[model samples]
Target chain A: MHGQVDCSPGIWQLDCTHLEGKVILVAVHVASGYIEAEVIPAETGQETAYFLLKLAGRWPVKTVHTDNGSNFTSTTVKAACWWAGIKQEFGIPYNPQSQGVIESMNKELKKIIGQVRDQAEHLKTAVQMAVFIHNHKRKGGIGGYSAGERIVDIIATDIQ
Target chain B: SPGIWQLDCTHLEGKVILVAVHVASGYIEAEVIPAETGQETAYFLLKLAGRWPVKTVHTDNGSNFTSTTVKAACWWAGIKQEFGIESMNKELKKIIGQVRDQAEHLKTAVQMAVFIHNHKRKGGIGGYSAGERIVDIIATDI
Candidate 1:
């Protein structure tokens, strides 16, 4: 999926995980492998809309991919995506292979949080730290560059 | 003003799992105890409130929750007790059953299960793992 300076498509995938009594919404950019997550207390269409709105405001997401959950299918979230001019896509239910990027993130995050946690109260900071570690570390997964580095590089070649 | 807690209980292997779900966040906390009693349930609420700023507690009319002990505990904690949802039991039972098949103790297992539940749940807006919108700006770019 690499070796091309032609990587301009910003494919961001997202999912929700319930951690420590709260729901964690995680977004992973397929190209750069960058992950951003926030803790919410419950799942709702409005909550999904707010998350998307926030994502739209801060990032240049071209296409957003998620599952067939009701929140994603809700008109509220569609409105958010429409207003932001980002294309939205959904995967098949029960089967997770379509959005494996975000699916694997849930496992990695659970492992990280399970290992070094002060329990649920600090779940927010724990996830923030997890994202910090993920974004800044160079890994074999992304051609030896950190997620942050690849993202910046993508920005460079895409707009230039 | 921002939180509602739903309480319920599930059976464990010679024990009980008292569960509380934060309505706004889908955040869950549970306790593994030998039995489900008003005293034990009330104490569970006390600990839960210590962990979160619980504004309102929603529970069924189950005696354990309706007991004077629970009501008093709610009064002391400044939590507005109300009758509402009871979805916590199903999750707790699943967690306990899964853990009983594993190596962890009941007390620790519920916590672990809760963490996993919060960490791995795939739910609303995108049909992935999401719910409860946060304004704290915790989702960082770093």
Candidate 2:
């Protein structure tokens, strides 16, 4: 599966004020169209390493693809892969198309969440509903299945 | 036989190297060294790789990573070389996103999100969880 690390922007006012550079890293299992994402304060190498190592323990990956971010190329991260025995794949420098899988997922998720952020009367409820749809009912690209089906396949694979 | 080997850079002299298997799959091995020079490191790898189908060897971009002796050893062993990690984090992000939404399904609150991702798949590799393809690979090989 391919992974893409990008920051999710918060809403902004007309005066151009908003949360600056709050980021999230997203990992997508391209075949089933399943995704695992987390919000982080910043995209540092140490944080990336810790975040990825947690996921590695869950999935036995053969090849992993990502963009050309410095955090992705840190020594700690390289060491972790060395330890995991997983192959590394990178997109072309400065070319977004090379990393389109996660890029597209990012856009789709934002569209869904953005809609909630725009119309909800209460911020908390919007978040709750957004997550609800994402986990239980939102339509993804892998046929008519939600990310839930793909998740089941992944867990089963790990058990086997 | 696939594993990681760690060489102790601080105390390379007169120490026996230790190799261990991966904690999870128990499918790969690793090593520890008190100290390792370019030549000593090459010697350590050569001895351990003697009778194994070493497919790959990884290391930082130190002189060790690109040394002539190391390269020759990998060539003889027919192992490929992999360098860098930034590429890895980005990849990890993709894998995580694929599964993150499933947490809601565990609570049994809704079920449609689960249906669409597996059935209507969209982006790269035909918009499915690249996991499906990976499962196919694991089934035949393992």
Candidate 3:
């Protein structure tokens, strides 16, 4: 019954994680497994608005899934999605696995941030480089191509 | 010409510093806030209201920036708001994180970091410091 939700390629999962007393928001496209992240100052609708705007610019997101956090539920964020013609939905309360795609991405993001936390002079640079590497590196699980390649292919297909 | 600005906040030893960085010049303005509240962020923005001919501001989805009050204030001030990538905030945090202990020193450290970063030549911007690039004047300190 829980599997009823469409796990279509255009679906995206949104989630946030805290590292060293800072909030990091992540968005993962379910189909291509591409990811985008930002380090926000706090969890608020305004912050979510900013993240969503950037996300929309990069990808033609059809739908977004997130937990019942206030940031996701805020009127401002909802309006932004509606204005952009993107559908927004929430997962079952207290059930994280429902948004498993972004959950998995979150774990990978944290691990990447942790590994380079101490070595990089700037955490932002480190995270940016990590995201770059993740998007460019080919993964066997994702059809032997990187997330960047997958996204480009999908976009190209749409254009054809 | 008008200037673009990047706004963000960072904390060290429990002290929060709200920062505004000029995109072209890399000049910075920062203030300490008791907490990450809409009121404080608004205050910071308001204080800088007339100082710069700011056309647009980019920031993360922090509640303070999203709040009705702050949003309205920005609108009234005639400044446009946009979301910023986390890279700038992260860079600020990394610099602040380098200075541990004594909250009093955070401001000075941030100022110094901005000064040096602005003066240093950057590879991406044709090996010119942000200051030099913006003003087309050689920095004597460098």
Candidate 4:
């Protein structure tokens, strides 16, 4: 069924990767094409869960979609997402195409990082601006508005 | 006036990147654009205005910069724009080329190149990174 769901609009796809030899967890807002990333000491259920906890402090993340990765489906992550008043959805089992949203972002990040070496602090900065630029960078596919502006426009139109 | 920035545009890989470097700190902001039009270049200038301190923007006599769109953008942002490279140029070209080749989107590669340049690239004689210097400037501006 393609794992499609109407609730996907508010969903943020989550995944993990390595950057500068450190664990980097990344997310993408499925609706807005907004991207976010963070570095953790290790990739565990606890670390994965904590990322969502911190992310919720800023963005109104209603749902998170992740693959069948063990850490993602672990008890702590499940408990954590529920505790944060967020719902979790699993991508179609064995169909990574369902994860194309965030997997593509991770691939793009690796290509950028493979260009050179960076430390944790620098990784954070790059990720910070990666999200910032990803949101602010305009494209025709999104109507020339950036991911940040696209979501802002979605909310702004509700008032008018 | 602090933060006299040099503005220019050049081709990065197969894309056009608008570059702004703060001469004092050597801080840089490079954004890729569809084309080097006055409107696009002006948009990048305003973005720089919001990101860091801007006193004077020195650039070449390129028509894209001299056009009305960019002129108004500079004037409205309270910048005294004037006419205006280095190891930074070659470094950026190399970085952008490397990243863009494998990037899913050209914009991602350019911004990533910018992030690497500002944050990862170390300083020269002054021993201050462009990222660190810009942070101090922005912090002190407050």
The estimated TM-scores of all candidates read 0.47, 0.40, 0.48, 0.45
Q: In what order do the candidates fall by lDDT, top score first?
A: 4, 1, 3, 2
Give per-residue CA lDDT, model 2, range B34-70, as digits (tens).
Answer: 3445565676678756744345665667676577887
Candidate 3 local lDDT, B45-134, one digit each (tens): 877777656678888888887877778778889888988424555666665444321122455556655655556567865556666665
Candidate numbers sorted by TM-score from highest down: 3, 1, 4, 2
lDDT of 4 at A103: 73
Return the lDDT, model 3, position B46.
78
Per-residue lDDT of A36-90 in model 2, one digit per residue for the tens?
A: 6655556777777776677677765555666668877778767776787756666
Q: Which residue runs does candidate 1 get wrong by more than 4 Å?
A: A1-8, A92-99, A119-121, A140-144, B1-142
For each candidate, C-alpha RMSD in Å?
A: 22.3, 18.3, 21.8, 15.3
Candidate 1 lDDT over residue span B90-117, tens digit each: 7656755554322224576567567666
Candidate 4, TM-score of its B chain: 0.85
lDDT of 4 at B74: 84
Candidate 1 lands at a TM-score of 0.47
* Off by more than 4 A, model 4: A1-160, B84-86, B121-127, B138-142
Worst lDDT window (10 residues) for model 2 chain A? A8-17
Better of 1 and 2 by lDDT: 1
Q: What DockQ does every candidate get?
A: 0.01, 0.02, 0.01, 0.01
Per-residue C-alpha lDDT of model 1 across residues A20-128, encoded as one tens digit per residue? 6788988876666677888876677788889988977877888898887887788998999999988998972121122255776777777777766764458888888
What is the C-alpha local distance difference test score of each model? 0.70, 0.47, 0.70, 0.72
